Amino acid sequence: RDQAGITGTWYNQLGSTFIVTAGADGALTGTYESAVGNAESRYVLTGRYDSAPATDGSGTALGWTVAWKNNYRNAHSATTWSGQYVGGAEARINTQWLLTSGTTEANAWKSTLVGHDTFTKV
Amino acid sequence: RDQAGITGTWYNQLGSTFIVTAGADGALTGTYESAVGNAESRYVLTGRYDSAPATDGSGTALGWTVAWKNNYRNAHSATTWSGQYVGGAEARINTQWLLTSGTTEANAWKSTLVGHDTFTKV
Amino acid sequence: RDQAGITGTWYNQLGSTFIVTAGADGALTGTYESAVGNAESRYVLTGRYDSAPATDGSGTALGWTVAWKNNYRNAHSATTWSGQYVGGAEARINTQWLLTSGTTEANAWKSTLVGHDTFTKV
Amino acid sequence: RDQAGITGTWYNQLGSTFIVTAGADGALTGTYESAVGNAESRYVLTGRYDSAPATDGSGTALGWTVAWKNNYRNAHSATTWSGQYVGGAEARINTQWLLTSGTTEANAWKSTLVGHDTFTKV
Ligand SMILES: O=C1N[C@H]2[C@H](CS[C@H]2CCCCNC(=O)c2ccc3c(c2)C(=O)c2ccccc2C3=O)N1
Ligand SMILES: O=C1N[C@H]2[C@H](CS[C@H]2CCCCNC(=O)c2ccc3c(c2)C(=O)c2ccccc2C3=O)N1
Ligand SMILES: O=C1N[C@H]2[C@H](CS[C@H]2CCCCNC(=O)c2ccc3c(c2)C(=O)c2ccccc2C3=O)N1
Ligand SMILES: O=C1N[C@H]2[C@H](CS[C@H]2CCCCNC(=O)c2ccc3c(c2)C(=O)c2ccccc2C3=O)N1
């Protein structure tokens, strides 16, 4: 599997830092530090990955969540990243993400941002 | 907070069943059973929620992930749901989701489905 | 085809009004009036639809765009709706949408909202 | 405005070709040729852009639609791209997109792909 390939420190195009441990069972646990937004220091993350991916050259599906509350700040929001790990000399995690803020019902139509992050080991 | 409001069994518009425990610290843990797709029985989920939401009538941001591997099937894919819990007499979890499949690099452009699920307690 | 089924006035869950003419060639032209956001009166829309859909009970794919500039306001943003028309006694257009604002490069990560609108004829 | 900056031929990361004319009034018209998918030759596109963007360094919001029917093929689907044009020496159009296929109601949950394309003039 890709437990060893996924475990470690990853960096996205914004300079954010994603530190993760992949468990043998499919668990992802770690911390996230965003270079942008209403965020400071590390936030807990948890997620899941496919611990027995296909053997045909396909990537490894995974996802995780951060709720943007820690001991320093609370942005009343959560981001989920959904994507796939691609191994090899220039390994990457290619993701799309959804960032939902708590809103009133009147403002729920503008609650959710969407974007895409690519994580590398360098 | 909404630990007690979120903890329990939820059902979406497709007939899927979302069983979750909210921890005092922001953790979400539980199981998901999809009424649709290449899925059978329960799958592990994990996520996060805002354990100290705003007090102005806003919803409570949260997200979770399921990797679609269990002891029965492996769809080589993962879904993340990002959304907000809205309390009250007809409590709901309103979500948008991203479902990424592991793909070859040539097919990565068609790796990710997007949709929206509303969960109720009934 | 669904030229006659799509042409006319549609209303979404927010109270917005979508007035459209479907051309024999796949064109969509009309106006949109949003019940929410930094918007007033009607805005031009244009789009495309599948003018020869499948005959197996599938919906009819379509999409359109509004740039949120008219003679009254300019929100420096554009929404695209992507979805499908479903005919019958309770015809609907089920959509997902992406609303991008012009931003500086530093803020591009938070440029795009995502949501979902359902349009009915009533 | 950016009528002259947007008008012309653009290429994305997949090798697709986007040929567009921007009108003084906010119109986008042209053709799209996809390097991937169930697509051959050129397809009509139409969209809208902000013809009076902010002057603070922000990008120019725009969107367009392609229904994937032409004289050669019909994929019973439509893509909308929502994004912003960024001018300068290395001008770009940064987009996110939604690709909806016509589906039966039972399959509507898996009707829509999401992705991101960056277009350059080179
Ligand atoms: O590494 C990274 N960093 C970024 C990406 C995805 S997570 C993100 C880092 C997130 C850090 C905590 N939230 C914020 O600061 C934040 C700032 C502004 C907005 C929101 C959140 C938000 O919810 C929102 C929702 C709906 C309409 C508008 C808005 C906003 O205007 N990748
Ligand atoms: O309760 C629920 N159930 C559903 C929603 C969101 S999770 C979903 C249940 C998911 C169950 C496991 N996956 C599947 O069966 C599955 C079936 C078909 C496709 C995919 C996955 C997929 O990745 C995909 C990605 C890119 C292009 C096309 C495709 C597919 O054509 N809410
Ligand atoms: O009928 C409808 N009405 C609505 C939906 C989809 S179109 C929408 C109506 C749109 C009317 C013109 N824009 C706005 O007022 C507007 C207001 C607030 C925001 C934005 C735009 C925006 O871009 C944005 C982008 C990124 C981060 C945060 C933000 C915002 O906070 N369906
Ligand atoms: O330049 C480009 N090219 C690409 C991107 C965005 S447009 C795209 C080019 C599109 C060309 C016409 N459609 C296709 O061939 C096509 C192929 C496979 C699928 C679909 C469409 C689809 O709807 C879909 C929807 C829901 C679940 C699964 C599926 C598919 O598995 N940028």
Spatial distance between the Cα atoms of B18 and B21, rounded to a whole number of angstroms: 10
Q: Provide residues of D within 8 Å CB-CB of chain A.
A: 96, 114-116
Give the closest-approach CA distance of C34 to chain B in angstroms. Answer: 21
User: Cα separation of B16 and B14, whole Å?
Assistant: 6
**Number of domain units in chain A:** 1
- Give the integer Cα–Cα distance in Å for D86 and B13: 40
Check C78 against D49: CB less than 8 A apart: yes
CA A81 to chain centre: 4
Q: Are A59 and A86 in contact (CB under 8 A)?
A: yes
CATH number, domain of B109, equals: 2.40.128.30
The alpha-carbon gap from D22 to the nearest alpha carbon of chain C, in Å, equals 13
Q: Using the beta-carbon criterion (under 8 Å), do D78 and C56 form an inter-chain contact?
A: no
Distance CA C20, CA C68 (A): 17
Name chain D's partners: 3 or more CB pairs within 8 A. A, B, C
CA neighbours closer than 13 Å in the CB half-sphere of residue D44: 19
Contact assessment for residue D65 and residue C47, using Cβ atoms and an 8 Å cutoff? yes
CA dihedral C78, C79, C80, C85 (to 10 degrees): -150
Of C105, C99, C39, C106, the C-alpha closest to C75 is C39
The C-alpha atoms of residue D30 and residue D49 are separated, in whole angstroms, by 13
Alpha carbon of C21 to those of A102, C8, C51, D31, D66: distances in Å? Answer: 37, 6, 13, 21, 17
Core vs surface per residue A53-65: b (16+ CB within 10 A) or e:
bbeeebbbbbbbb
Structure tokens at A106: 């009147």
Using the CB atoms, write b or e for C41-66: b if 16+ within 10 Å: ebbbbbbbbbbebbeeebbbbbbbbb
Quickly list DSSP for C72-111. Answer: S-EEEEEEEEEEEEE-STT-EEEEEEEEEE---GGGGGG-
Sign of the alpha-carbon torsion through B78, B83, B86, B89: negative
d(CA B15, CA B32) in angstroms, rounded, equals 11
Between chain A and chain B, the number of residue pairs with CB atoms below 8 A apart is: 203
Based on DSSP, count helices (H) and strands (E) in chain B, helices before strands. Answer: 1, 8
Closest residue in chain D to residue A113, using alpha carbons only:
D96
For residues C111 and D6, give the distance between their C-alpha atoms in angstroms, rounded to a whole number.
Answer: 19
Distance CA A56, CA A61 (A): 14
- Give DSSP secondary structure letters for B35-74: SSSS--S-EEEEEEE-SS--SSS--EEEEEEEEEE-SS-E
Per DSSP, D4 falls in state H
Helix (H, G, I), strand (E, B) or coil at A54: coil
How far, CA to CA in Å, does B119 sit from each of A81, B85, B112, D107? Answer: 20, 9, 22, 19
Domain containing B96: what range? Answer: 3-120
Q: How many CB atoms sit inside 10 A of residue A32's CB?
A: 23
Q: How many CB atoms lie within 10 A of CB B90?
A: 9
Number of B–C residue contacts, CB under 8 Å: 8
Determined by which method?
X-ray
Which residues line the pocket of ligand 3, CB cutoff 6 A? Answer: A 109-110, 113; C 12, 14, 16, 34, 36-39, 68, 75, 77, 79, 97, 99, 101, 110-113, 115, 117
Ligand nearest the Cα of residue A102 is 1
Report chain B residues touching chain C, CB-CB < 8 A. 96, 114-116
| Of residues D13, D76, D11, the one with CA closest to residue D39 | D76
Q: What resolution, expressed in A, was reported for this entry? A: 1.4
